[PDB]
Amino acid sequence: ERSASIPFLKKPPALDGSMVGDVGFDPLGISTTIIELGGDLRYVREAELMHGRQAMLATVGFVFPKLFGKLPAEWAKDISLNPLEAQYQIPPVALGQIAISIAIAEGLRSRIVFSNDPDYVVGDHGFGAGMLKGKSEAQVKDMKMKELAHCRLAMVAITGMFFQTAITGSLYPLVDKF
Amino acid sequence: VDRSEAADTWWGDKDYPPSIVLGIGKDVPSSIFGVTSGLAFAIGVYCVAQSNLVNILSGSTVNGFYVAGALLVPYSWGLHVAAWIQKQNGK
Amino acid sequence: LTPFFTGNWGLYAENPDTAQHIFGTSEGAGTAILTFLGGFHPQTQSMWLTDIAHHHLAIAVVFIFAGHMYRTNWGIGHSMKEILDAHVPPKGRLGAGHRGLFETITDSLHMQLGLALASLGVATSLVAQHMYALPSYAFMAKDYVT
Amino acid sequence: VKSQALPFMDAPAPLDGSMAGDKGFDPLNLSGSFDIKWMREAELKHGRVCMLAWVGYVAVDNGFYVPFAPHVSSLAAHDAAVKAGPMLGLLLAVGAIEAISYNAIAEMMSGETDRRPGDFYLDPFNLCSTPEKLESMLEKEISHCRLAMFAFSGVVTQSALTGGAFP
Numbered sequence A: 001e002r003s004a005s006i007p008f009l010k011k012p013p014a015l016d017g018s019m020v021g022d023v024g025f026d027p028l029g030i031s032t033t034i035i036e037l038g039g040d041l042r043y044v045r046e047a048e049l050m051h052g053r054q055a056m057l058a059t060v061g062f063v064f065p066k067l068f069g070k071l072p073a074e075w076a077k078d079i080s081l082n083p084l085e086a087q088y089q090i091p092p093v094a095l096g097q098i099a100i101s102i103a104i105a106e107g108l109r110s111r112i113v114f115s116n117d118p119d120y121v122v123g124d125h126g127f128g129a130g131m132l133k134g135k136s137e138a139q140v141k142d143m144k145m146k147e148l149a150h151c152r153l154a155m156v157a158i159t160g161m162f163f164q165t166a167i168t169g170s171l172y173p174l175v176d177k178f
Numbered sequence B: 001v002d003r004s005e006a007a008d009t010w011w012g013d014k015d016y017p018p019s020i021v022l023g024i025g026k027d028v029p030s031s032i033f034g035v036t037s038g039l040a041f042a043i044g045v046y047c048v049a050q051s052n053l054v055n056i057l058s059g060s061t062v063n064g065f066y067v068a069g070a071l072l073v074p075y076s077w078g079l080h081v082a083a084w085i086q087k088q089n090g091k
Numbered sequence C: 001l002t003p004f005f006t007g008n009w010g011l012y013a014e015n016p017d018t019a020q021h022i023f024g025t026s027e028g029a030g031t032a033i034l035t036f037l038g039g040f041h042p043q044t045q046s047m048w049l050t051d052i053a054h055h056h057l058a059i060a061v062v063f064i065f066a067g068h069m070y071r072t073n074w075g076i077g078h079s080m081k082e083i084l085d086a087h088v089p090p091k092g093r094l095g096a097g098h099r100g101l102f103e104t105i106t107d108s109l110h111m112q113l114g115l116a117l118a119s120l121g122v123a124t125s126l127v128a129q130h131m132y133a134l135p136s137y138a139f140m141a142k143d144y145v146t
Numbered sequence D: 001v002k003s004q005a006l007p008f009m010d011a012p013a014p015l016d017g018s019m020a021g022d023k024g025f026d027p028l029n030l031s032g033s034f035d036i037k038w039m040r041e042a043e044l045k046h047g048r049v050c051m052l053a054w055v056g057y058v059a060v061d062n063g064f065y066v067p068f069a070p071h072v073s074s075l076a077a078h079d080a081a082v083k084a085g086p087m088l089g090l091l092l093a094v095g096a097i098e099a100i101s102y103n104a105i106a107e108m109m110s111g112e113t114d115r116r117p118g119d120f121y122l123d124p125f126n127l128c129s130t131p132e133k134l135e136s137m138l139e140k141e142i143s144h145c146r147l148a149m150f151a152f153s154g155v156v157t158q159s160a161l162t163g164g165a166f167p
């Protein structure tokens, strides 16, 4: 009858607590219109996990090359330490290598993403799935919830760091002046 | 809005609209509607005259308050039609 | 954006482009971004880009306002079926009025297609009539073939 | 019934002792005219804004400041803060709450939720546990809301008039 995250708005009809990180947070009702259309929230959850995991990797990579040495610097020595300028300075060889690897990996991902298989657990691509062999159901759900929390935090973190580096050029307590 | 969730506002068999057409103002009396419509007409025509007739408009003289008050003239028309509708509906 | 926030938006019209301006060069160039000079740019014989930018900015205000007319999941708004149902003139002048038109339009795709095609044909005639009378692109007026 | 504060007429229909601060004061039928839940939410919102406005005005005029402030009187503090920038950030921060309030008002007036106007369920210490506490605190809140509306109106008008010290 009422959301848990926002305790003065109605609970989203689409969300019903049967998902990791379901705290009834949908003021717009994007989930509501999705289920009214006829879809299911598997796609949005998988997009959440994908965006988040990318955001965590990119958060660490935003500050690593400055706080720690920018590699042994055979070719990277020319490229600036500012992440917003490093993107426009990768050499063609390295840019093509990384682009090809990402493209092949996500072309592999696409078929299972857009399949009709119900066995597919959302955000379960088999990469390092061996540590859940011994985990219990409560442990599995709680670990997936820590994953989702980290995802959700890193997504906002990149927006903060990107806008701060664009408008100020410096993150305040950590990396400065880059 | 769907086909089902829509009020019965057809009034071709009757002499005046139902008050439901007025929506949020389905209960404000005809007296309030008429007084507000008259004040709106006077204020809006004053604003329009002060903006373009008494003065000459320009980049350095366009006035936001007069521009906004100009929009009370069509609101005045709506309010006077509303006053008639509520007077006929008995409110 | 200090003029925009202070509300002194006439500073964006102040200092328009001069009549001796040459398109693509800084000589004779102004600083105004939003003007209503009208007429045509003398060198190019096309309307001022400041005028066109002001046009698109204002027209958008109007359309973004008008896009809050109808009721969508928040109570405030309008009901098109209700509007059509009530619009019947007194004493049955236009018969039963516009009753049933909502149902027919929303059920029949051909009526929607016909309305769209009529509106778009009128708009195509309008652009044909307006582009030649009021050129908007630089040096198009002297390009007679185009 | 025959209204209080206008003892020669009757309170409009919505005023029936249902809500806090109902002193039977609506001579123009201006709440029987339009839904009184919206009226009460507007009253509460005005009152909260004016409570915060009065206390902030007094604090800034007395000398309360932030780690980086223009250090100016609270009258010109609006222009100073705007030119500095963070006032627009306050605009975004309150706009988030106001869009969520758009949602809440829509559900409250439609009937999807049994929400009282100006009730965001912000009760950390359960200061409204029993209904007696609920009406007592609502009464106090509305009285303070109205009084703070008047207080800030007086303070800001007087400051814009004379441009003097705190009082």
Ligand SMILES: CCCCCC(=O)OC\C(C=C=C1C(C)(C)C[C@H](OC(C)=O)C[C@@]1(C)O)=C/C=C/C(C)=C/C=C/C=C(C)/C=C/C=C(\C)C(=O)C[C@@]12O[C@]1(C)C[C@@H](O)CC2(C)C
Binding pocket: B030, B031, B032, B034, B035, B037, B038, B039, B041, B042, B048, B070, B071, B073, B074, B076, B077, B080, B083
């Ligand atoms: C103020 C003095 C007193 C006033 C009294 C008054 O009026 O009462 C009410 C009344 C008669 C009455 C009375 C009763 C209701 C029977 C009882 C009342 O007694 C009570 C209630 O107790 C008093 C009494 C006897 O009088 C009737 C009043 C009728 C009135 C005043 C009708 C104006 C239409 C205007 C139109 C159509 C304009 C279109 C204007 C157009 C088309 C535009 O220009 C639009 C526009 O270009 C603009 C401007 C800006 C541009 O951006 C673009 C747009 C397109 C937006």
Ligand SMILES: CC1=C(C#C/C(C)=C/C=C/C(C)=C/C=C/C=C(C)/C=C/C=C(C)/C=C/[C@@]23O[C@]2(C)C[C@@H](O)CC3(C)C)C(C)(C)C[C@H](O)C1
Binding pocket: A056, A057, A059, A060, A127, A128, A129, A130, A131, A150, A153, A154, A157, A158, A160, A161, A171, A172, A173, A174
């Ligand atoms: C914006 C901003 C700030 C901020 C911020 C915040 C809060 C940032 C937060 C960032 C956050 C929360 C970042 C998470 C990273 C997670 C990692 C690295 C996980 C990797 C995990 C990997 C690489 C796993 C590899 C595996 O192969 C292993 C080893 C075992 C196998 O079985 C399989 C798996 C796949 C498991 C500052 C800095 C505070 C300053 C100022 O406030 C402004």
